[PDB]
Every structure is written in C-alpha cells, then in structure tokens.
Design an enzyme around this catalytic site. Structure first.
Site, PDB file in Angstrom:
ATOM      1  N   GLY D   8       0.810  -1.207   0.000  1.00  0.00           N
ATOM      2  CA  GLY D   8       0.000   0.000   0.000  1.00  0.00           C
ATOM      3  C   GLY D   8       0.844   1.258   0.000  1.00  0.00           C
ATOM      4  O   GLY D   8       1.976   1.287   0.481  1.00  0.00           O
ATOM      5  N   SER D  32      -4.313   0.547  -2.106  1.00  0.00           N
ATOM      6  CA  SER D  32      -3.914  -0.136  -0.883  1.00  0.00           C
ATOM      7  C   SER D  32      -4.367  -1.588  -0.942  1.00  0.00           C
ATOM      8  O   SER D  32      -5.526  -1.868  -1.266  1.00  0.00           O
ATOM      9  CB  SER D  32      -4.507   0.552   0.347  1.00  0.00           C
ATOM     10  OG  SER D  32      -5.913   0.394   0.385  1.00  0.00           O
ATOM     11  N   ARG D  33      -3.454  -2.504  -0.627  1.00  0.00           N
ATOM     12  CA  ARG D  33      -3.741  -3.933  -0.644  1.00  0.00           C
ATOM     13  C   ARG D  33      -4.507  -4.401   0.586  1.00  0.00           C
ATOM     14  O   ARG D  33      -4.618  -5.613   0.804  1.00  0.00           O
ATOM     15  CB  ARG D  33      -2.440  -4.728  -0.772  1.00  0.00           C
ATOM     16  CG  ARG D  33      -1.967  -4.921  -2.201  1.00  0.00           C
ATOM     17  CD  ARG D  33      -0.450  -4.885  -2.294  1.00  0.00           C
ATOM     18  NE  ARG D  33       0.047  -3.552  -2.616  1.00  0.00           N
ATOM     19  CZ  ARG D  33       1.314  -3.271  -2.886  1.00  0.00           C
ATOM     20  NH1 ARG D  33       2.247  -4.208  -2.878  1.00  0.00           N
ATOM     21  NH2 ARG D  33       1.653  -2.017  -3.172  1.00  0.00           N
ATOM     22  N   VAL D  34      -5.030  -3.477   1.393  1.00  0.00           N
ATOM     23  CA  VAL D  34      -5.771  -3.859   2.587  1.00  0.00           C
ATOM     24  C   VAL D  34      -7.096  -4.503   2.194  1.00  0.00           C
ATOM     25  O   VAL D  34      -7.715  -4.151   1.179  1.00  0.00           O
ATOM     26  CB  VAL D  34      -5.990  -2.637   3.498  1.00  0.00           C
ATOM     27  CG1 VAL D  34      -6.878  -1.610   2.813  1.00  0.00           C
ATOM     28  CG2 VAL D  34      -6.584  -3.058   4.836  1.00  0.00           C
TER      29      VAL D  34
END
Lengths: 32, 116, 292, 68
Positions: D8, D32-34
């Site tokens: 992210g 963001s890879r969240v």
C-alpha cells in the site's frame, strides 16, 4: 521463357478485382 | 507456437493481431500530438480496430474475488479464436468501446452492449 | 543515448513555434471573416419583404410550390472545407450526412448527392458512391457567381422531373430529382458550432392570419423565386467559412498546449541519463585506480 | 525498494496543492492492498464506487472545452 510467361498470364485469371427543418414563406392573408 | 503443432487458423489469427498492434504502436508517435484528424480514414479504421481489440483482452479472473466482488470466468480456446476472428473481420465496430472493459465472453459482450 | 534526445527537443520546439504562429494567424482571420459575413442582411430582408408582399395577393401555384405526387428520389448537397487541421468539423459534417441518409433510407428512395470541397470529395471517393459533380477551390473565399451557378444547376435538376414516372423520363428526356437537402454548419457563438441539415427545395405557405403590379404578377413571381434561392445559397457560404475558421483555432491552441509537456518530460529524462552516465564513469575509474 | 517491501501507498503531488486544494491525494495511483475488514460495515455500505467515479471524472474533465 518470356513466351511461356505471356501464354500463362493469358491463361491465368485473377481472383480479385423530426429534425428536418423547413423553409417557408409568410403571407399576411388569413387562412382560407 | 508453430503451424506444425497448432492449426493454421490460430497461427493466422495471431499473426494478424500482432501486425495490427505493431502498426498502432508505430502510429502512436504521430497521434500523440495532433490526434486522429491529420490521419486518413484508411488508418482511422485500423486505429479503431486496434483500440477495440486491445480493450477486449481484459478479463476478470477469480483471484480478484476479494477485490472486485464479482465471480470469475472461463473461456474455451475455440470460443476465443472464433470471437477473435469475428472481431478481426471488423463487424463489431458498431458497439461502443466501454462495453469491452472487463468482459467475460461474447454473449456477455452482446448483453452488456445492448443493455447500455 | 543523448543525441536522439536533443534532436527530439529541437523538433518539438520548432513544432511549438509553428503551431503558435498558425493559431495567431487564424485568430487574426476570424475578425475579417466576421466583418464580411454580416453584410448581406439588408438585401435578404428586402428581398424577403418583396417576395412576401408580391405573393400575398398572388395565386399560389408553382413547380417549386407544388410537390411530386410520388416519392421517386431525393437529392442532397454536402459542404466541406478545403484544408486540413480543422478538428472534428469534417467528422461532424459527415456524421450528420450519414444520419440524414439513414433517415431517408426508411422511405426506400435512392438518393443522389453533390459535393463541394476536396476533403469530403476524397472521403466519398474512397467509399463506393456516385458523385454527379464536384466544386473545389473557393471555400476559403466565396463569391456570388458560384452560388448563382449552383442554384441554377439545382433548380434545373428539380425542373427536370415534370413527368418522371418509374424509369421513364418522359418528355424531359433525363431522369430528374424530386427533393433537395442542404447540410452545413451555423455560427451559434465563438465556441458553439453545431451542424444543421435543412430542407428547402419545395416552398410552403403558412398563413399568419389577420400595391400595384405594373407587369404580369405571375411573371414577376416566377422571375423572383430563383433570386431568393440563389440568395439563400450565397448566405450559406459565409457562415460555413466562419464556422470552419472558428473550429480551426482551438486545434492549434490545444496542439501547442500538448506539445509543451513533451519538452518537459524529455528534459527530465536527459538530465537523469547524464547524471547516471557521469556517476557510472567515476565509479568505474575509481574502482580501477584503487585496485592497484 | 521501499514500495516493494511494504504494502500500500499514498501519493501526494504538487499539482493539486498548487491549484488550491489543500489535501492533495491522487485517485489513479494510490491503491492499498488492505482487505475490506478495515472499514466498518456501515462505512462500506454507505460509500461505494467512489474511486471509479472520480477516475472517470478525471478522464472526462479533459474535454471540458467541447460540449457538443
């Protein structure tokens, strides 16, 4: 060779080859 | 990839796609400043075809299930080659571009195109 | 590499200068075009008043006033420009022409077209269609004579359909047309220009509700109508030219604005490459020197 | 190296700040890879498809000079 080419090219064949407005005129006379 | 291993139609389709994409890449230098106006229609058709065919390569794989919230898709190669041959014929130019963004198959293609 | 970057920088700078000059010249020409176009209003108003007053007490009967009883065919005329770099002007004109063709296709009538301008002539030449006649070379600066001759030809073509039945030309001798159309662009504003297609071949009368004619009133009426047609045809050209130039200017403006960023990006890339090269050279030479 | 090691990122550029908007956050790069567990269910329900709408707005604004 050129004679043979001419002969073949003679033998060979080719496979390829609303929205409309109108313009009017106005007249003062009442509509009949 | 070779005609000895694979049928001739697949080879021809791949070659034509490569040629179209390469020609579009070549025209990219000129188009980037003036635009499409300076070019002739004989290249306008190729530009439109290249845009649509390049947009068609997008897909929604199942690994994005946790991101896009949509299921995946599967496409057999026979349907793929048939659809790509149809597209390279040039019939599908009527449909708008944004239809092909993240599409699964030609049936979904037509459904999305006609639903908009 | 380095030389290619410098070459592209020089080319982009020259292109920017040329485009700026062209934009300024077009902006200069806009004012003269606007001054020229607005000089035909009084004659048009007076001729319209004359025609209306003469026809008020006159009989309503004329080939341009009567209609063909059958839908044989319909003519059409398309205007264009004589130079490129105009933007979407040609595209808009051609799209309007195509949509008009689609509209007329619903009646099954085979259309016939007349083209003016080199660009549209070539565009239709690549396509498979017939072109009766082409007029080129005077779109930038028009005059009354060309409009008069165009109107005369079109009126003669319309008159040639007196007894055209089926494929039989009748006593006319040539198959004629039954309808005409005009496609062009008007001048709504300095930034508002929309293509307009209108029908003007057969006249029609609308009564708005409620002199002395020394010669034959019918003769005066018949002589007067072609003048009205020619005046309308002439009035089309000035608006066409003004719209063309107004559309032209913005293309050059946007071209220069887009050309600047290429210079910026190439400058950044060149600086980065120079720094990388010098640091690599110094690293190599120090490494070579210290090894001994 | 740092963007590779971490997950992210948030991008801040000078163009929007100079234009006048103080919080300068781009919409086409900041991903963001969240997972979705970070946002409350109410937040996820009320807000959706904002990023795509802003991206298409940023694509459309380039043609504000052509209303035809």
């Amino acid at each position: 060779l050129v004679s043979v080419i001419n002969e073949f090219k003679k033998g060979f064949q080719a496979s390829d080859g609303e929205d409309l407005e109108k313009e009017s005129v106005k007249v003062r006379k009442p509509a009949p | 990839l070779d005609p000895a291993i694979v049928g001739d139609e697949h080879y021809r389709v791949a070659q034509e796609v490569i040629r179209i994409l390469q020609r579009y890449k070549d025209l990219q230098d000129i188009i980037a400043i003036l635009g499409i106006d300076e070019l002739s229609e004989e290249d306008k058709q190729l530009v439109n075809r290249a845009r649509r065919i390049e947009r068609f390569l997008s897909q929604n794989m199942m690994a994005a299930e946790q991101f896009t919230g949509q299921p995946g898709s599967t496409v057999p190669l026979k349907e793929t080659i048939e659809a790509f041959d149809k597209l390279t014929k040039g019939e599908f130019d009527h449909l708008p571009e944004q239809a092909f963004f993240l599409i699964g198959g030609l049936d979904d293609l037509a459904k999305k195109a006609e639903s908009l | 590499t380095l030389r290619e970057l410098r070459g592209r920088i020089r080319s982009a700078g020259s292109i920017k200068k040329i485009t700026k000059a062209q934009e300024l010249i077009a902006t200069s020409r806009i004012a003269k075009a606007q001054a020229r176009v607005e000089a035909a209003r009084p004659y048009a108003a007076e001729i319209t008043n004359m025609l209306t007053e003469l026809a008020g007490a006159s009989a309503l009967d004329h080939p341009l006033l009567v209609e063909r009883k059958q839908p044989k065919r319909a003519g059409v005329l398309v205007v264009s420009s004589d130079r490129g770099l105009c933007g979407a002007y040609n595209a808009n004109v051609l799209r309007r022409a195509e949509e008009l063709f689609s509209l007329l296709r619903d009646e099954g009538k085979d259309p016939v077209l007349y083209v003016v301008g080199r660009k549209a002539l070539g565009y239709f030449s690549f396509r498979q269609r017939t072109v009766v006649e082409s007029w080129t070379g005077f779109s930038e600066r028009p005059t009354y004579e060309n409009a008069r001759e165009i109107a005369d030809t079109l009126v003669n073509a319309f008159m040639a359909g007196a007894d055209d039945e089926g494929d039989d030309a009748g006593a006319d001798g040539i198959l004629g047309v039954d309808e005409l159309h005009i496609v062009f662009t008007e001048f709504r504003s300095m930034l508002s220009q929309t293509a307009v297609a209108r029908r003007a071949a057969p006249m029609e009368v609308e009564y708005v509700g409620e002199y002395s004619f020394e010669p034959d009133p019918e003769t005066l009426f018949d002589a007067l109508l072609p003048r009205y047609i020619a005046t309308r045809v002439y009035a089309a050209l000035l608006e066409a030219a003004a719209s063309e130039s107004a559309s032209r200017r913005r293309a050059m403006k946007s071209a220069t604005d887009n050309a600047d960023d290429l210079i910026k990006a190439l400058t950044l890339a060149a600086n980065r490459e120079r720094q990388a090269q010098i640091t690599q050279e110094i690293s190599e030479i120090v490494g070579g020197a210290n090894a001994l | 190296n740092v963007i590779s090691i971490t997950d992210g990122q948030c991008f801040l550029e000078s163009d929007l700040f100079n234009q006048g908007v103080r919080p300068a956050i781009n919409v086409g790069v900041s991903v963001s890879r969240v997972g979705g567990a970070a946002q409350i269910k109410a937040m996820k329900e009320v807000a959706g498809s904002l990023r795509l709408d802003l991206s298409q707005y940023r694509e459309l604004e380039a043609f504000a000079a052509f209303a035809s």
